[PDB]
Symmetry: D2
Subunit: 254 residues, 4 copies
């Protein structure tokens, strides 16, 4: 039960975002929720989306994580508007589609550093900024994929940015541990989302989990958010630097 | 919230047992509990410990997991007394002191296999028998230690038995997954218990955690119980074949 | 270059044994070789496969690794016939078909313990006895498969025995380290051998390597031998407790 | 024996460089060696160090791996000068001490990307350009540290870059496999070099190896070279996407 908790959720794009999965779960559990979004263009659709929750007030902030200034100011404003927070769900990544298809050895320097910037480094800056709002400690969660642990076809530069994110999580957990801030990842199985259109052979991915994963089915955004609730609540009070696979068991098989 | 769930908790010896931390949590959340023990002396402790729980009824069964007969008849009697169950917590291990306190290369054959038998194989047969009382699906959790992933001083034959337990969890997840039975491990940090006395240098392991783990503190049995509640409940649907470290982040550092 | 080195090779049955590929490689490098066998039928293949080798002398010893006395007396006799040795290649496992070709959760106790006894514990007692023949250091290599680290279809009880075996290597590495005895594993890809017949769906494992592994081809026994040369030689002097995958990069993909 | 093979060795600054360890080993095995450097001062040191080697001529090229054109032109020029090569040893990393000597969560964006760029991405672009001199296949080896797998104190932004690098290796292995180009990492234990100076508490890392690693001693640059000879030669055919820890066992213990 998450009454009198406040969590910032970063990365809702539409009804299919894993982060709207997380949001519906935390909302039902009585958390006060704050949202960040990337582009002022899509604020309109995002307000409509959140009418579905039981949040009595919309707290929305434009933060594109390629800007220090936007993360610093955005979190500073959150603090003034809502006070101290209990945690952050990070659900954000990016690479150029044109890097993701064909040959990883052909990746450009710019495209490689972009995916690092948005998909890994953003966590670090967000943690430093969000720590200011968690004087008594709290919980940080980022979303990764099995590609950060193994070479998976077509995932290319994003795999290497996930490898990076996953270690980011570990170095943060160590750094912020003495402050009572826990930092974990959830490693989600494949789910149909906006950003999933940028991954070549997605249907073959989904298909294969159904065929081969221990549970013989794919997972969904609500299953991610239920593990997010665990990771963000006191239920997981002993757990940091961890990566939980919400992937129907697929990480465990070969 | 676990009203109308029933769980079987194997391996309480006293108030310090990790499994009694699990019981206190699940009892607090409303679950019906069933308990198994090997020694007479443990049944007597269990009768005393039950006065601190809300359990209106004392369901206790002697099960020495070295005996198929006892595991088989144990679980049969459970389904006869309480009906279908929702999961099993397995909190059982053993090894001879004289293997543990020698160099590993001197482990006796009968010692090595004794450790396998009680600490790993017991999970396999328990799962087979518990499966019969889980026609709708369910969840099974076993307790491991970090010495099954790495070589730790003084842990010797138990390390190799936990390496076996951890694979046993994964093979079980794969097998039972289509039956909607999830199988997971919790890798607990060092906790002072009766059996912790068989681990040479134990106080030193404790101090290392306080000094070096992200959270700079040790964990306790209620904290294992809280992760156990997540794994035995529907919050962790989609998670199987997983090993969740409740160890203050110590697994993530080196 | 292993001139004036002596190695003991355990587990040749015929021309397709991985251990025979080890032999061909260490023989080509000038090593003096000693072979151990279980069935008198394997001693007859060894006498025939010897003609193929440069070995001027046959050094052949019956050692069933289920018998302490056979391992003890075998290695003592090796010592008396050839003097101190430089290392041991262990290429030995077993499980019953009846356990292997069932659901893993249906595994028998005696079959589970048989598979641990021959496939894991055998290493620990061989290391202990072999150590008396390595008073100034040496190398011990055992053979494992990816099914030790992941739940692989059809591999069942042998997956748990390989998990055990891989921890055995780490614990042995840690114990025997200060004696300058290194202990490592080779994780071989699927190779068609006599024992391969005991893995269900083995043909479909071979073909999956060809299509999905980075090198897009299956390995052979000579490739395992070449990596065993490295591990068993001064080339790998600061390497210990390690698992080397000789599998065309299959371990690294999902 | 690497007679009539040619290897490009990137990252020698002085006698203590790990890459000079590679160089001595391969030069001793009869390989033709080409060397790349960044600072003119490193070139001068290469000219002196060459006197110790068997190399009958100096093949030195300036390649700052931050520069696409310097990588592209350096390798092209290498092909014209010596022809086709057999592989590359990459021994290059960098980060600012002002990001390294402060909390991880305080890392600057530009510092984070700097270390990714020099320490991880350089491998990708080196592979793409070096593939052009390997029509026949070959071997590429990069140098990493355990800090890429675990959160180690003081290593901070370099550990996230080594994590990126180890995933880079796996993805390069999958991408260049069908070209018969193998791609691997060596995980070296701590060695006194010039860059070691950038790691806070380096002396306390050295001594922990001695006290705790299985072999109870630190390793040196020649041991790295010895495993590099194995990865770069036909002995490790079958081996790709892998990370060999040349670290006296340390990775296997907790
Ligand atoms: N779907 C899967 O199968 C899967 C599996 C495992 C992990 N994940 C991970 O889960 C997370 C969410 O992905 P998703 O599938 O839910 O897709 P999604 O709905 O498209 O969400 C991705 C979000 O990232 C935001 N974003 C991208 N760049 C940003 C920037 N510079 N600043 C702020 N926000 C930015 C996007 O904003 P805009 O729409 O405004 O661009 C979008 O809201 C990602 O980390 C992804 O890598 C996904
Ligand atoms: N304490 C730690 O720091 C630590 C850390 C990580 C993991 N673990 C694991 O946590 C689990 C619980 O251990 P613990 O520390 O809580 O110690 P504990 O209180 O001593 O419990 C050990 C239990 O194992 C039972 N047991 C042993 N052999 C049995 C058999 N043949 N049949 C049925 N029960 C048997 C004992 O029952 P009887 O007394 O009646 O014989 C006892 O209840 C174990 O798997 C242990 O390896 C412990
Ligand atoms: N083939 C593969 O795809 C593959 C892949 C990965 C790992 N491996 C591993 O490689 C190793 C060798 O297997 P292989 O494929 O070469 O098969 P193999 O040629 O059939 O050899 C297996 C050997 O095990 C010996 N052995 C079994 N039980 C023994 C006992 N109780 N005492 C003494 N020796 C015993 C057998 O000897 P007898 O015939 O005299 O009884 C036989 O020589 C095994 O550890 C296996 O698990 C194989
Ligand atoms: N020493 C250790 O304990 C240790 C342990 C594990 C891994 N490693 C790794 O081993 C590799 C070599 O380090 P080391 O200890 O041998 O130190 P080193 O002797 O100081 O070598 C580092 C090399 O990196 C080069 N370099 C830095 N930035 C470059 C750039 N932009 N372009 C071209 N070259 C660049 C330097 O060249 P210039 O001087 O000419 O700039 C130098 O030759 C690194 O990847 C390091 O992470 C070291
Ligand atoms: N967010 C996001 C995202 C961006 C790109 Br471009 C590619 C994939 C993205 O999310 C995923 C979707 C699907 C999978 Cl399987 C993994 C992901 O990381
Ligand atoms: N149960 C149990 C158990 C039995 C022996 Br003998 C040795 C250790 C046991 O439990 C643990 C206690 C402490 C630690 Cl750190 C790990 C454990 O596995
Ligand atoms: N030795 C041996 C062995 C015995 C049985 Br029963 C089953 C498999 C055995 O070796 C393998 C054959 C094939 C593979 Cl893929 C892995 C192995 O461990
Ligand atoms: N090359 C390099 C390098 C540069 C910086 Br700045 C920091 C460390 C570097 O090398 C290492 C030295 C020592 C260790 Cl233990 C690890 C390393 O990766
Ligand atoms: N440290 C003592 C006491 C045992 C324990 O720590 O549990 C020993 O080495 O046996
Ligand atoms: N797949 C067949 C053939 C056995 C084998 O592949 O070795 C089976 O289950 O027996
Ligand atoms: N430990 C000192 C010296 C650095 C080193 O060990 O290289 C520091 O933190 O800077």
């Amino acid at each position: 039960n998450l009454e009198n908790k406040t969590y910032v959720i970063m990365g809702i794009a539409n009804k299919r975002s894993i982060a709207f999965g997380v949001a519906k779960v935390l909302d039902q559990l009585g958390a006060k929720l704050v949202f960040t979004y990337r582009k002022e263009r899509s604020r309109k659709e995002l307000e409509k989306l959140l009418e579905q929750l039981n949040q009595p007030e919309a707290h929305l902030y434009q933060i594109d994580v390629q800007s220090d200034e936007e993360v610093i100011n955005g979190f500073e404003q959150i603090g003034k508007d809502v006070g101290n927070i209990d945690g952050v769900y990070h659900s954000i990544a990016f690479a150029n589609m044109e890097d993701l298809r064909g040959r990883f050895s052909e990746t450009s320097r710019e495209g490689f550093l972009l995916a690092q910037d948005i998909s890994s480094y953003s966590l670090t800056i967000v943690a430093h900024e969000a720590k200011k709002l968690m004087p008594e400690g709290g919980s940080i969660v980022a979303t990764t994929y099995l590609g950060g642990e193994f070479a998976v076809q077509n995932y290319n530069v994003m795999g290497v940015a996930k490898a990076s994110l996953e270690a980011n999580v570990k170095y943060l957990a160590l750094d912020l541990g003495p402050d009572n801030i826990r930092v974990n990842a959830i490693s989600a199985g494949p789910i149909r989302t906006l950003s999933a259109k940028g991954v070549g052979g997605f249907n073959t991915i989904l298909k294969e989990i159904e065929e081969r994963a221990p549970l013989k089915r794919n997972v969904d955004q609500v299953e991610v958010g239920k593990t997010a609730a665990y990771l963000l609540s006191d239920l997981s009070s002993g757990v940091t630097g961890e990566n939980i696979h919400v992937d129907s068991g697929f990480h465990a098989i070969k």
